[PDB]
Design a protein around this nucleic acid. Structure first.
Lengths: 17, 796
RNA sequence: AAUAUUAAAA
């Protein structure tokens, strides 16, 4: 499921959205 | 924008000896002389222009030309082996050509030298670009004779059927011919020959043409308003020839008035044809053809003139019946292309000998590689894997990687209950429920709703009702009685209006249920509900998956011969990659560029960031539906559009872009050199066969990959052309990845002919047309998808 | 609309 495991979800950038 | 050069030759895969329908062409290191032609009147068909240039090279040899054999392209380009005795100034001719005689005024002016020595150097050293002027002059010469003896349609040539007859109904028949193109290939220019086939209008009386268009065995009645219009939409613009006198006319309209009533300068057409030619019409109740000057011809003195290709779209019966008349096994196409070459005898062509061109007799041999198939990871209790065999695998013993537990669902039947009684509905759901649990997608409850409906006008009130009555509703199963306007209205209401997952099944497949058909239904259903069927085994993927990467597919579909063109760009929303989100637009008809690409990419990048909380460091862009010739203009716009989207998202966000054109519309055909390696009744090449030598570009990054198994006919290997690569792929890395993306297509446990991203964009663009079924702002609104549905793969 | 492939695109 994960869709991740690139690791390191990062809180250091503009949030786009 | 300079296309990236080939980084290297691929190395992975079992070797396979192959034959390609390319033929080596040898040209001398000489200059050829290029003159521009002006013909007045200047808007004549190319078949007429060739009669003009032919007459004057026949009738003006002492003054100019002499013993030269010039070659002509039907328009303004004409090429000679030695330069005509002319300066830089124009030379005018007065030409009269024999029906009746037409006078033409022709002008020739020198233009430039075209160097075939230069074309040699680009194929050996690559230090200059392939001179298109040299390639164009070579193609004109090699096809000049065929252009005088056959009927050119595009790059093909056809002749009227002799002996055979492949009728399509509706006044259309099938003509067989061949394709001929000249491209450069690493080790020489290559002549590309293939069998071709297209539809033509039957050379038959207009009365017979009218009957086939309207379905009638001739019980006299006039034409109804519905019949007059449908007959007009079919014959308007076509050409007819008269039999009472032998002239030819273009039809511009069909009179709203019968032949006995239609008048003109006062006098009816019926009386005029009595008052002369002493003809008493057998069908004066039928209309006349208008050929605005007021000249009208009754249908019975007109025949449809042969040689008119049919550009209009064919019905479902007409495409199905043409597919059967043209599909041959791969060995059959081999011997047919071989027959055409022997018949052509290009080395004995007087024009080909004029320019010293030599054509190789036999099909080019090249050794390709059968890439190894990726392994698909499934989930469920077993966590089984799938080993593709011949580009095919099955669900036996496997459950979905993420199975959706279906708790609430409804059934809407649109076939009459006489055809689909309650007893056969119960058997259908029972079989589907069992197979769905096997696949790990438990359809647990019985339908919270199950009614019979009739008409397309009932779907919205019923679907509005379902969304309000049943909380937590996941799926509506819609049973349909064949082709119906209900399907579009189901998709319009579901996808765009209410945001509700829907799975349409034909009533024919409900009465008789195949477990394979039920399994293929669940593949769509589980994904329509936000599930994952399988994933590529992760550790066998390319290194681009070590950092956030997004995969995009793109396609443009054009309206048949004012409907708009539809562009679609899909984006991977995960790292597997399995889930894709879709964007779609409408634009002016027959614009090949995706005008709204910049904002469509922006939306996909934002959705990717919401689904993963990652920003892509790389963008892999597979572009489908590209015509050659407009390729530089398309890439220039679209590559800057992708970059512009990244610039507008962050101040310093510069991900690497790989731009790949996927071309399935071409006449490059590959064959097994060893007969023992032919696969299936069709005898095609194995799935995974790759070629990036011998027939590909001299120094640019392209390859052929036939990723699918050929069921019928001759397989079309997909051509992939890398137009931009910031990510600096190797040949192996990109060929394997393209092949692995061909195994991530959710609608079947098969390896398909193009990557899943490009295929999804195609599905999205086709679904947009059902959304446009009954103002550009209103057209743009009709293809907008409900906010609940943007987040899912509705297009499956 | 189970699905892929196949041909076209007066």
């Amino acid at each position: 499921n994960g869709t991740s495991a690139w690791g390191k979800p990062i809180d250091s950038g503009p949030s786009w959205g | 924008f300079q296309a990236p050069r080939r980084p290297g030759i691929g190395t992975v895969g079992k070797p396979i000896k192959l034959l390609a329908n390319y033929f080596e062409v040898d040209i001398p290191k000489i200059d050829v002389y290029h003159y521009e032609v002006d013909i007045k009147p200047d808007k004549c068909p190319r078949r007429v222009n060739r009669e003009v240039v032919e007459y004057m090279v026949q009738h003006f040899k002492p003054q100019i030309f002499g013993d030269r054999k010039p070659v002509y392209d039907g328009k303004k380009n004409i090429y000679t082996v030695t330069a005509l005795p002319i300066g830089n100034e124009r030379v005018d001719f007065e030409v009269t050509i024999p029906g009746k005689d037409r006078i033409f005024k022709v002008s020739i002016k020198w233009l430039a030298i075209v160097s075939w020595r230069m074309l040699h150097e680009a194929l050996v050293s690559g230090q200059i670009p392939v001179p298109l002027e040299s390639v164009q002059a070579l193609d004109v010469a090699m096809r000049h004779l065929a252009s005088m003896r056959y009927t050119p349609v595009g790059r093909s040539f056809f002749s009227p059927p002799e002996g055979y007859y492949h009728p399509l109904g509706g006044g259309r028949e099938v003509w067989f011919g061949f394709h001929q193109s000249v491209r450069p290939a690493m080790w020489k220019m290559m002549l590309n020959i293939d069998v071709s086939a297209t539809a033509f209008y039957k050379a038959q009386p207009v009365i017979e043409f009218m009957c086939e268009v309207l379905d009638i065995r001739n019980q006299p009645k006039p034409l109804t308003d519905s019949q007059r219009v449908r007959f007009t939409k079919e014959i308007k613009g076509l050409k007819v020839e008269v039999t009472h006198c032998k002239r030819k006319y273009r039809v511009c309209n069909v009179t709203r008035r019968p032949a006995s009533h239609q008048t003109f300068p006062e006098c009816t057409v019926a009386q005029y044809f009595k008052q002369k030619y002493n003809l008493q019409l057998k069908y004066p109740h039928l209309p006349c053809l208008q050929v605005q000057k007021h000249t009208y011809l009754p249908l019975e003195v007109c025949n449809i003139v042969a040689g008119q290709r049919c550009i209009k779209k064919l019905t479902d019966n007409q495409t199905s019946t043409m597919i059967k008349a043209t599909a041959r096994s791969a060995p059959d196409r081999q011997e047919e292309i071989s027959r055409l070459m022997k018949n052509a005898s290009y080395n004995l062509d007087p024009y080909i000998q004029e320019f010293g061109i030599k054509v190789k007799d036999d099909m080019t041999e090249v050794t390709g590689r059968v890439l190894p198939a990726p392994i698909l990871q499934y989930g469920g209790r077993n966590r089984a894997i799938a080993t593709p065999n011949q580009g095919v695998w099955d669900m036996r013993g496997k459950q979905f990687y993420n199975g959706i537990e279906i708790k609430v669902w409804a059934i809407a039947c649109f076939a009459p209950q006489k055809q689909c009684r309650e007893e056969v509905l119960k058997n259908f759901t029972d079989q589907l429920r069992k197979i769905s649990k096997d696949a790990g997608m438990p359809i647990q409850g019985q339908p919270c709703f199950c009614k019979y409906a009739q008409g397309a006008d009932s779907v919205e009130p019923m679907f509005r009702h379902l969304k309000n009555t049943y909380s937590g509703l996941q799926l509506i199963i819609v049973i349909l009685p064949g082709k119906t306007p209900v399907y579009a209205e189901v998709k319009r209401v579901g996808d765009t209006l209410l945001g509700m997952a829907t799975q349409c099944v034909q009533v024919k497949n409900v009465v008789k249920t195949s477990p394979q058909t039920l399994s293929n239904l669940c593949l769509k259903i589980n994904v329509k509900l936000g599930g994952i069927n399988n994933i590529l085994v992760p550790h066998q993927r390319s290194a681009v998956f070590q950092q956030p990467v997004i995969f995009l597919g793109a396609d443009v579909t054009h309206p048949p011969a004012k409907k708009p063109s539809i562009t679609a760009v899909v984006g991977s929303m995960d790292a597997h990659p399995s889930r894709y989100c879709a964007t779609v637009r409408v634009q002016r008809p027959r614009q090949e560029i995706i005008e709204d690409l910049s904002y469509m990419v922006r939306e996909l990048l934002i959705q990717f960031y919401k689904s993963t909380r990652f920003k892509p460091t790389r963008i892999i862009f597979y572009r489908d539906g590209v015509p050659e010739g407009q390729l530089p203009q398309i890439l220039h716009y679209e590559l800057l559009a992708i970059r512009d989207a990244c610039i507008k998202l962050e101040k310093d966000y510069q991900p690497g872009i790989t731009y790949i054109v996927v071309q399935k519309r071409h006449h490059t055909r590959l064959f097994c050199a060893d007969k023992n390696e032919r696969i299936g009744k069709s005898g095609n090449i194995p799935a995974g066969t790759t070629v990036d030598t011998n027939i590909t570009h001299p120094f640019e990054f392209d390859f052929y990959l036939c990723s699918h198994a050929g069921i019928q006919g001759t397989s079309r290997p997909s051509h992939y052309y890398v137009l931009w690569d910031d990510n600096r792929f190797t040949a192996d890395e990109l060929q394997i990845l393209t092949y692995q993306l061909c195994h991530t297509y959710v609608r079947c446990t098969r390896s398909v002919s193009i990557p899943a991203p490009a295929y999804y964009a195609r599905l999205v663009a086709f679904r947009a047309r059902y959304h446009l079924v009954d103002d550009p702002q209103a057209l743009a609104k009709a293809v907008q998808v409900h906010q609940d549905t943007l987040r899912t793969m509705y297009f499956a």
